[PDB]
Amino acid sequence: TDEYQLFEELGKGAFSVVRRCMKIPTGQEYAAKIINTKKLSARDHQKLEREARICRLLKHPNIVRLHDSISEEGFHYLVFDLVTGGELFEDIVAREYYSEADASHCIQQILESVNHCHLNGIVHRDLKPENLLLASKSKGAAVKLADFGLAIEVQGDQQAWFGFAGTPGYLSPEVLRKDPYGKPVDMWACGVILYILLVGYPPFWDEDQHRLYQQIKAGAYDFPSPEWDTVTPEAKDLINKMLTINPAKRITASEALKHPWICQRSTVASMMHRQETVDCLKKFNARRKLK
Ligand SMILES: CN(C)C(=O)c1cc2cnc(Nc3ccc(N4CCNCC4)cn3)nc2n1C1CCCC1
């Protein structure tokens, strides 16, 4: 800990904070989650070691890397390799060309990280734009799935009621019905994200959170004209299969990586520029920054 220098705030939590830090003797930059271990519940104490254990298990080019776990007097540090490219969604709105192919490229990377989570018995439970970063400012920076603070460990394909966790706009139907759930919830979130990547606004939305949940449980999304008239049928097909209410028939991550819009991207995904999507995303990002 004394080996690290702390700088600005990168995030905030109930009993934690995320700060940019640097390894003093070598100058390597990291993102450290600083948890005040003092006056911490037993429940909260198990969640902390569960996050450390989960992050330690995940080594993948599309997942953030845990560098160190540190226990000090009254504080605990979760040190991750720092990614400097910012949010994927903020990078897209800065582009001059953005098409289905780019969205397919992004979702493919997200699907690799989700598939690598599920192959290791880990369900993220909170897939959302804030947790989708870009490795660098380099042209071809890799997408990085971040923040496993809500992730859970599961055995095989055994569902269970693991609790009401996540973000309202991305919650699956089965979590809202308080049914047992598992890996498919991440794939419902990927469906929401993919929808937003194509048109720039969420498939489910309402001022009243109670109406939102009725929309989600009913699968009350559609592909309205005119913006969806130019989206390929294969792109709507992949979304459909992710936003499938029945969790058993919902497409898995390994199946989605073999969908023609993903694996045959160069000949299936449209290359047309979608400026209206860029414009909508700019508004979507602005609304997020308020809350
Ligand atoms: C710490 N934990 C548990 C992680 O999973 C984790 C590993 C991370 C590695 N690199 C970053 N770099 C980074 C991320 C966001 C921003 N901001 C740019 C300006 N506005 C919005 C955000 C700036 N830099 N962040 C990481 N995170 C967290 C992701 C959310 C915050 C910290």
UniProtKB/Swiss-Prot annotation:
<dbReference type="GO" id="GO:0016020">
    <property type="term" value="C:membrane"/>
</dbReference>
<dbReference type="GO" id="GO:0005654">
    <property type="term" value="C:nucleoplasm"/>
</dbReference>
<dbReference type="GO" id="GO:0042383">
    <property type="term" value="C:sarcolemma"/>
</dbReference>
<keyword id="KW-1003">Cell membrane</keyword>
<dbReference type="GO" id="GO:0055119">
    <property type="term" value="P:relaxation of cardiac muscle"/>
</dbReference>
<dbReference type="GO" id="GO:0006468">
    <property type="term" value="P:protein phosphorylation"/>
</dbReference>
<keyword id="KW-0723">Serine/threonine-protein kinase</keyword>
<keyword id="KW-0597">Phosphoprotein</keyword>
<dbReference type="GO" id="GO:0043005">
    <property type="term" value="C:neuron projection"/>
</dbReference>
<protein>
    <recommendedName>
        <fullName>Calcium/calmodulin-dependent protein kinase type II subunit delta</fullName>
        <ecNumber>2.7.11.17</ecNumber>
    </recommendedName>
</protein>
<dbReference type="GO" id="GO:0098909">
    <property type="term" value="P:regulation of cardiac muscle cell action potential involved in regulation of contraction"/>
</dbReference>
<dbReference type="GO" id="GO:0010649">
    <property type="term" value="P:regulation of cell communication by electrical coupling"/>
</dbReference>
<dbReference type="GO" id="GO:0010666">
    <property type="term" value="P:positive regulation of cardiac muscle cell apoptotic process"/>
</dbReference>
<keyword id="KW-0808">Transferase</keyword>
<keyword id="KW-0472">Membrane</keyword>
<feature type="region of interest" description="Autoinhibitory domain">
    <location>
        <begin position="273"/>
        <end position="282"/>
    </location>
</feature>
<dbReference type="GO" id="GO:0005524">
    <property type="term" value="F:ATP binding"/>
</dbReference>
<dbReference type="GO" id="GO:0060291">
    <property type="term" value="P:long-term synaptic potentiation"/>
</dbReference>
<dbReference type="GO" id="GO:0048168">
    <property type="term" value="P:regulation of neuronal synaptic plasticity"/>
</dbReference>
<dbReference type="GO" id="GO:0031432">
    <property type="term" value="F:titin binding"/>
</dbReference>
<dbReference type="GO" id="GO:0002026">
    <property type="term" value="P:regulation of the force of heart contraction"/>
</dbReference>
<keyword id="KW-0007">Acetylation</keyword>
<dbReference type="GO" id="GO:0014069">
    <property type="term" value="C:postsynaptic density"/>
</dbReference>
<dbReference type="GO" id="GO:1902306">
    <property type="term" value="P:negative regulation of sodium ion transmembrane transport"/>
</dbReference>
<feature type="binding site">
    <location>
        <position position="33"/>
    </location>
    <ligand>
        <name>ATP</name>
    </ligand>
</feature>
<dbReference type="GO" id="GO:1903076">
    <property type="term" value="P:regulation of protein localization to plasma membrane"/>
</dbReference>
<dbReference type="GO" id="GO:0033017">
    <property type="term" value="C:sarcoplasmic reticulum membrane"/>
</dbReference>
<dbReference type="GO" id="GO:0098901">
    <property type="term" value="P:regulation of cardiac muscle cell action potential"/>
</dbReference>
<dbReference type="GO" id="GO:1901844">
    <property type="term" value="P:regulation of cell communication by electrical coupling involved in cardiac conduction"/>
</dbReference>
<feature type="region of interest" description="Calmodulin-binding">
    <location>
        <begin position="281"/>
        <end position="291"/>
    </location>
</feature>
<feature type="binding site">
    <location>
        <begin position="10"/>
        <end position="18"/>
    </location>
    <ligand>
        <name>ATP</name>
    </ligand>
</feature>
<dbReference type="GO" id="GO:0086003">
    <property type="term" value="P:cardiac muscle cell contraction"/>
</dbReference>
<dbReference type="GO" id="GO:0010881">
    <property type="term" value="P:regulation of cardiac muscle contraction by regulation of the release of sequestered calcium ion"/>
</dbReference>
<dbReference type="GO" id="GO:0106310">
    <property type="term" value="F:protein serine kinase activity"/>
</dbReference>
<dbReference type="GO" id="GO:0071277">
    <property type="term" value="P:cellular response to calcium ion"/>
</dbReference>
<dbReference type="GO" id="GO:0005516">
    <property type="term" value="F:calmodulin binding"/>
</dbReference>
<dbReference type="GO" id="GO:0005634">
    <property type="term" value="C:nucleus"/>
</dbReference>
<keyword id="KW-0703">Sarcoplasmic reticulum</keyword>
<dbReference type="GO" id="GO:1902514">
    <property type="term" value="P:regulation of calcium ion transmembrane transport via high voltage-gated calcium channel"/>
</dbReference>
<comment type="function">
    <text>Calcium/calmodulin-dependent protein kinase involved in the regulation of Ca(2+) homeostatis and excitation-contraction coupling (ECC) in heart by targeting ion channels, transporters and accessory proteins involved in Ca(2+) influx into the myocyte, Ca(2+) release from the sarcoplasmic reticulum (SR), SR Ca(2+) uptake and Na(+) and K(+) channel transport. Targets also transcription factors and signaling molecules to regulate heart function. In its activated form, is involved in the pathogenesis of dilated cardiomyopathy and heart failure.</text>
</comment>
<dbReference type="GO" id="GO:0030666">
    <property type="term" value="C:endocytic vesicle membrane"/>
</dbReference>
<dbReference type="GO" id="GO:0005954">
    <property type="term" value="C:calcium- and calmodulin-dependent protein kinase complex"/>
</dbReference>
